[PDB]
Amino acid sequence: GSSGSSGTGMKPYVCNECGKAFRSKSYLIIHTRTHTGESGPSSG
Ligand SMILES: [Zn+2]
Known part of the structure; x- marks a missing residue:
């Protein structure tokens, strides 16, 4: 039990x-x- 998450x-x-939050x-x-x-897919 604790309150802070520091x-x-x-x-x-x-x-x-x-900013993807996980468990x-x-x-x-x-x-x-x-x-x-990024490397894979790209545009001309
Ligand atoms: Zn990410």
Whole structure:
């Protein structure tokens, strides 16, 4: 039991890149990688 959610950052497992909030760090880690979806698709 505790009220604060403080630590070595602003959000818990939220993506500080886009803001995607998750339940566990494992969910944010496997996501933060998806951000690498630029090379593939592109435009002329
Ligand atoms: Zn993200």
